[PDB]
Design an enzyme around this catalytic site. Structure first.
Site, short mmCIF file in Angstrom:
data_model
loop_
_atom_site.label_atom_id
_atom_site.label_comp_id
_atom_site.label_asym_id
_atom_site.label_seq_id
_atom_site.Cartn_x
_atom_site.Cartn_y
_atom_site.Cartn_z
N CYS A 108 0.81 -1.42 0.11
CA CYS A 108 -0.27 0.02 0.13
C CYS A 108 1.04 1.54 -0.28
O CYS A 108 1.75 0.99 1.25
CB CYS A 108 -0.63 -0.18 1.26
SG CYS A 108 -2.45 1.94 1.20
N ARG A 111 0.09 5.25 2.42
CA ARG A 111 0.07 5.02 4.56
C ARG A 111 0.16 6.15 5.17
O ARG A 111 0.30 6.28 5.99
CB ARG A 111 0.87 3.89 4.50
CG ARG A 111 0.91 1.98 3.99
CD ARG A 111 1.66 1.44 5.04
NE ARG A 111 2.32 1.28 3.13
CZ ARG A 111 3.55 1.24 3.68
NH1 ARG A 111 3.88 0.51 4.88
NH2 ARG A 111 4.37 0.71 2.58
N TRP A 280 -9.36 6.07 -1.30
CA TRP A 280 -9.76 6.83 -2.45
C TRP A 280 -8.54 6.00 -3.93
O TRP A 280 -7.50 5.47 -3.17
CB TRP A 280 -9.94 8.11 -2.72
CG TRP A 280 -8.79 8.72 -1.69
CD1 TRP A 280 -7.55 9.62 -2.61
CD2 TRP A 280 -8.27 9.33 -0.58
NE1 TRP A 280 -6.37 9.64 -1.71
CE2 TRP A 280 -7.13 9.93 -0.45
CE3 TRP A 280 -9.11 9.36 0.18
CZ2 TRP A 280 -6.52 10.22 0.24
CZ3 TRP A 280 -8.93 9.85 1.39
CH2 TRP A 280 -7.62 11.31 2.07
N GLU A 285 -5.02 3.39 -11.34
CA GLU A 285 -5.65 1.67 -10.59
C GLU A 285 -6.84 1.63 -11.85
O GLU A 285 -5.97 0.66 -12.08
CB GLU A 285 -5.77 1.89 -9.66
CG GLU A 285 -4.95 2.08 -8.37
CD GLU A 285 -5.89 1.61 -6.99
OE1 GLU A 285 -5.86 0.88 -6.17
OE2 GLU A 285 -5.54 3.62 -6.35
C1 HEM Z 1 -6.71 6.91 0.81
C2 HEM Z 1 -6.38 6.47 -0.28
C3 HEM Z 1 -5.34 5.50 -0.44
C4 HEM Z 1 -4.68 5.28 -1.76
C5 HEM Z 1 -4.49 5.64 -3.27
C6 HEM Z 1 -4.67 3.72 -1.54
C7 HEM Z 1 -3.56 2.88 -1.95
C8 HEM Z 1 -3.20 2.00 -2.87
C9 HEM Z 1 -2.37 1.54 -3.78
C10 HEM Z 1 -2.68 2.50 -5.19
C11 HEM Z 1 -2.45 0.09 -4.03
C12 HEM Z 1 -2.02 -0.86 -4.99
C13 HEM Z 1 -3.57 -1.73 -5.45
C14 HEM Z 1 -3.35 -2.72 -6.38
O1 HEM Z 1 -3.09 -2.77 -7.67
O2 HEM Z 1 -4.12 -3.64 -6.62
C15 HEM Z 1 -2.74 -0.33 -2.56
C16 HEM Z 1 -2.78 -1.43 -2.00
C17 HEM Z 1 -3.49 -1.71 -0.78
N1 HEM Z 1 -3.97 -1.00 -0.19
FE1 HEM Z 1 -4.23 0.69 0.11
N2 HEM Z 1 -4.50 2.97 -0.54
C18 HEM Z 1 -5.43 3.81 0.26
C19 HEM Z 1 -6.37 4.18 1.45
C20 HEM Z 1 -6.45 2.76 1.74
C21 HEM Z 1 -7.48 2.01 3.14
C22 HEM Z 1 -8.36 1.96 3.84
C23 HEM Z 1 -6.49 0.45 3.15
C24 HEM Z 1 -6.81 -0.09 4.54
C25 HEM Z 1 -7.51 0.17 5.51
C26 HEM Z 1 -5.30 0.38 1.95
C27 HEM Z 1 -5.23 -0.66 2.01
C28 HEM Z 1 -4.41 -1.16 1.03
C29 HEM Z 1 -4.25 -2.80 1.92
C30 HEM Z 1 -4.52 -3.38 2.92
C31 HEM Z 1 -3.16 -2.70 -0.33
C32 HEM Z 1 -2.61 -4.27 -0.17
C33 HEM Z 1 -3.83 -5.33 -1.43
C34 HEM Z 1 -2.76 -6.15 -1.47
O3 HEM Z 1 -1.78 -7.02 -1.03
O4 HEM Z 1 -3.64 -6.71 -3.00
N3 HEM Z 1 -5.36 1.82 1.83
N4 HEM Z 1 -3.38 0.54 -2.04
C1 LIG Z 2 -8.89 1.00 0.59
C2 LIG Z 2 -7.82 0.07 -1.36
C3 LIG Z 2 -7.30 1.62 -1.78
C4 LIG Z 2 -7.10 1.89 -3.67
N1 LIG Z 2 -6.61 3.23 -4.22
N2 LIG Z 2 -6.82 0.88 -3.79
C5 LIG Z 2 -7.60 -0.73 -3.18
C6 LIG Z 2 -6.60 -2.04 -4.42
C7 LIG Z 2 -7.50 -1.97 -4.97
C8 LIG Z 2 -8.20 -1.46 -5.86
N3 LIG Z 2 -7.79 -1.88 -7.47
C9 LIG Z 2 -7.42 -3.31 -6.94
C10 LIG Z 2 -7.79 -3.25 -6.01
N4 LIG Z 2 -6.49 -3.92 -4.93
C11 LIG Z 2 -7.15 -5.43 -4.90
C12 LIG Z 2 -6.32 -6.73 -5.48
N5 LIG Z 2 -5.40 -7.93 -5.34
C13 LIG Z 2 -4.38 -7.21 -5.67
C14 LIG Z 2 -3.65 -9.62 -5.77
C15 LIG Z 2 -4.30 -9.73 -6.40
C16 LIG Z 2 -4.89 -9.26 -7.87
C17 LIG Z 2 -5.90 -10.22 -8.44
C18 LIG Z 2 -5.53 -11.43 -8.18
C19 LIG Z 2 -5.67 -12.20 -6.66
F1 LIG Z 2 -5.76 -13.13 -6.45
C20 LIG Z 2 -4.67 -11.20 -6.09
C21 LIG Z 2 -7.36 -0.68 -1.90
#
Ligand code: HEM
Ligand SMILES: Cc1cc(N)nc(C[C@H]2CNC[C@H]2NCCNCCc2cccc(F)c2)c1
Ligand code: HEM
Ligand SMILES: Cc1cc(N)nc(C[C@H]2CNC[C@H]2NCCNCCc2cccc(F)c2)c1
Ligand SMILES: C[C@H](O)[C@H](O)[C@H]1CNc2nc(N)[nH]c(=O)c2N1
Ligand SMILES: C[C@H](O)[C@H](O)[C@H]1CNc2nc(N)[nH]c(=O)c2N1
Ligand SMILES: [Zn+2]
EC number: 1.14.13.39
Lengths: 404, 403
Positions: A108, A111, A280, A285
């Site tokens: 993420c 953060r 957001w 994305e």
């Molecule tokens: C406030 C604006 C936020 C932005 C711009 C943001 C941004 C992102 C982005 C770009 C990713 C990678 C997405 C992908 O390509 O799958 C991501 C992954 C992630 N985000 Fe954030 N986030 C935000 C808020 C949050 C919040 C509230 C959480 C959880 C409480 C969060 C938790 C996570 C987690 C846990 C991942 C890992 C997803 C995975 O492993 O597939 N984000 N976030």
């Molecule tokens: C909370 C929050 C904010 C933000 N900006 N963005 C996010 C990730 C979301 C939104 N747009 C992509 C998705 N991310 C979660 C997708 N998981 C990625 C790993 C994956 C992918 C495909 C198959 C799998 F088995 C596993 C979360």
């Protein structure tokens, strides 16, 4: 030097050592012999020790480490386990855990916002109907007419010999993917499975490229129940270009709220199988992955043709030029519609800021480079030039097997 | 104990089995991935490394378990037992070098690996001779603009004595002049080597595109300065397909990417000066050398030519100008007839390379973060392919700056 990973930013020449990694109780999948860091997934006293560590983290965050409250809470947690097998978080414990799981998330990049999360306790939840109610409140609160707010809704924790609370959808808002007889897909090819499950469980489906899916919500030991979001609840942005006037005639659109809903939140050994969280979007994305991935919407050729580009040769950089405009179109449309969004430049700059804050506060920040660096324009952003140490800290968001 | 490797675009799975033949640990432990670091933190053995490499080579030519193979295993057993080292035959050197490249996991160009001209320069006793060898390698590898991969292998490391070393990081690199005003005129990555050249005799220019001399060191001797003859080093002035003004900028870039401070290791012997070239992939010049902020950092200048709004990140003037610059790099190479591969074409053939290796070896070890280009990552098939990284020998390694 110091017996800890040395970490360098090749743009500015600055050095740090990550001392936080020493805190990891969980092993990832790498070893001296081979790096496996580009893999998306890899495959009692145990509870106590996890519990205790969480409690110690709790008490440290409020500067009461050593106190009687601290030791009494420890005494309390172990007595509860010794007599029932599990134990329960106090309210402000759950709030701190959930924030800490976001903070610990290596993939993420948003953060810098970690401390500002709205935590809805939903641990009283007793039905799939109620789950629906909670979910709609979440969406309402978070969406906030386009001025978006971070939130997470914690449903009841896994119990021993008592089936889980589970949202089947991977996100709260997702577009259907319909399998055709050509073999092609109409809509989002990512979602072909969940669409098909929704129909077999009784949804009457549409036939658009952008049909919002119903929720399949599962309460303990029941088949899941189906729920349709009221359309006034699901805020959407039609897409248009600030200059290329024909772009809006493509009928492309995306929803405002990204809300992960199938991830498992783990705090001090307790597993919350249902705890959708939302923030957001970062513009890449939508504009680069969802719209341009070959295996998703795949609109690159379309746009490039409209753009009069030479699509018969790689060296025209026609893919690059079209992705830039699809991206500018995502940004301009959200801005116009006054919905929160962050570009990949701003986003990354602010993760750099987040890096040197975490350096002062914990001496480290777990980060997955491959995910932190954006899918377009990577070396133009400052994270590309920053080395990163990736390790697992608890509280965490884990992935979990699909319910079916 | 075998890594499952998936492609997220097409859904296909492979298990890597090659990586067991790794004999040298990298920097990750289970407790933490260090995959993204650029550099590492820092008789009986040499014998078995040599055994294994000789075992490698007699399989390459389908001659494993034969008479010529045993009498080569004995030759080595004998030479190490007597002198604590041994020497390679030209054909073995040759197979070694190609394999060094086959094994290089940061390399996107390995589809080419079977096709390498190899100059044996192991009869070299003076910096002077190295200059000559280095020049022939340039003339050959450049071939009027029809680039051909080449390596020149100088004499190995020896227990008693200094290393043969090239002080330069590339055979051809531009210089770095620090100014009164802390502004570095010319090229920033090479401010130090520019200063070393001055420290050892060189009169400097003051252009942005001045070609550095060479500093060549023979064992235990101070380095000697040698000047590349201006007709040898082929350059490409940069212009643009549509934007008339882009030329004006004095933008140029040299044709031959030739690494020269890396160290080639084979069957346990170490080659401290083995410089090698191929051809450029356009994004190395367009994105990195020109748009890195710590390199020529031309982006703003350009975006202002292009007349984009630079007050704000969300206009994406950064992205917009990065694409024009990469497109000028490609056009201008194609206009002056010099091998150049774009990043889409390059990563496509890498995918093809992965399939070949998978059939031939059970894997290809690779480094995802280096292999994925620095613009348009997910636009390339490599963004979506999982990859395993590890160390196989023969190999190119980093080694310390000689000074
Ligand atoms: C406030 C604006 C936020 C932005 C711009 C943001 C941004 C992102 C982005 C770009 C990713 C990678 C997405 C992908 O390509 O799958 C991501 C992954 C992630 N985000 Fe954030 N986030 C935000 C808020 C949050 C919040 C509230 C959480 C959880 C409480 C969060 C938790 C996570 C987690 C846990 C991942 C890992 C997803 C995975 O492993 O597939 N984000 N976030
Ligand atoms: C909370 C929050 C904010 C933000 N900006 N963005 C996010 C990730 C979301 C939104 N747009 C992509 C998705 N991310 C979660 C997708 N998981 C990625 C790993 C994956 C992918 C495909 C198959 C799998 F088995 C596993 C979360
Ligand atoms: C033939 C065309 C070739 C192309 C297009 C090419 C392309 C590339 C690129 C883009 C990189 C990453 C460079 C960087 O970002 O620093 C790289 C790395 C590398 N290449 Fe290739 N290469 C080619 C031929 C060769 C040859 C002939 C060799 C040796 C014989 C070679 C050995 C290496 C090695 C060892 C690296 C990693 C070195 C490092 O850590 O910088 N390549 N190559
Ligand atoms: C043979 C070949 C062909 C090609 N196209 N490209 C190449 C890599 C060369 C050229 N373009 C970048 C340069 N790469 C070699 C040096 N590594 C770059 C970063 C680095 C690494 C280690 C220590 C440092 F201080 C800095 C080789
Ligand atoms: C194979 C590779 O790990 C995979 O494509 C990853 C790379 N980096 C990513 N980074 C982000 N933010 N999101 C992703 O889905 C991916 N995909
Ligand atoms: C810090 C990070 O590992 C570093 O910037 C790497 C990332 N990927 C790269 N990839 C290539 N091809 N060349 C590079 O120099 C780098 N740099
Ligand atoms: Zn690793």
């Amino acid at each position: 030097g110091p017996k800890f990973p040395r970490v360098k930013n090749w743009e500015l020449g600055s050095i740090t050592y990550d001392t936080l990694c020493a805190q990891s109780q969980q092993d990832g999948p790498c070893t001296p012999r081979r790096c496996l860091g580009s893999l998306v997934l890899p495959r009692a006293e145990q509870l106590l020790s996890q519990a205790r560590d969480f409690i110690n983290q709790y008490y440290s965050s409020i500067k009461r480490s050593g106190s009687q409250a601290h030791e009494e809470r420890l005494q309390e947690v172990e007595a509860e386990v010794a007599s029932t097998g599990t134990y329960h978080l106090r309210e402000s414990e759950l709030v701190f855990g959930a924030k800490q799981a976001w903070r610990n998330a290596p993939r993420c990049v948003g953060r810098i916002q970690w401390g500002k999360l709205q935590v809805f306790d939903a641990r009283d939840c007793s039905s799939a109907q109620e789950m629906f109610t909670y979910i709609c409140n979440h969406i309402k609160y978070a969406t906030n007419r386009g001025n978006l707010r971070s939130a997470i809704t914690v449903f009841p924790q896994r119990a021993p010999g008592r089936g889980d609370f589970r949202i089947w959808n991977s996100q709260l808002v997702r577009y259907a993917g319909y399998r055709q007889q050509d073999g092609s897909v109409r809509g989002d090819p990512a979602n072909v499975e969940i669409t098909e499950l929704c129909i077999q469980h009784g949804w009457t489906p549409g036939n658009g490229r952008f049909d919002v899916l119903p929720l399949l919500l599962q309460a303990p030991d029941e088949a899941p129940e189906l729920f349709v979001l009221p359309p006034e609840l699901v805020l959407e942005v039609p897409l248009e270009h600030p200059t290329l006037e024909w772009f809006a005639a493509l009928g492309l659109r995306w929803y405002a709220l990204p809300a992960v809903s199938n991830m498992l939140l783990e705090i001090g050994g307790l597993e919350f199988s249902a705890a959708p969280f939302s923030g957001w979007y970062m513009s890449t994305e939508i504009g680069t992955r969802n719209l341009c991935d070959p295996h998703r919407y795949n609109i690159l050729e379309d746009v490039a043709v409209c753009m009069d580009l030479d699509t018969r040769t790689t060296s025209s950089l026609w893919k690059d030029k079209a992705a830039v405009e699809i991206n500018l179109a995502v940004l301009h449309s959200f801005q116009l519609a006054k919905v929160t969004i962050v570009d990949h430049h701003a986003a990354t700059v602010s993760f750099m800021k987040h890096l040197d804050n975490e350096q002062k506060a914990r001496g480290g920040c777990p980060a997955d480079w491959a995910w932190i660096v954006p899918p377009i324009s990577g070396s133009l952003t400052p994270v590309f030039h920053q080395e990163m140490v990736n390790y697992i800290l608890s509280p965490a968001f884990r992935y979990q097997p699909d319910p079916w």
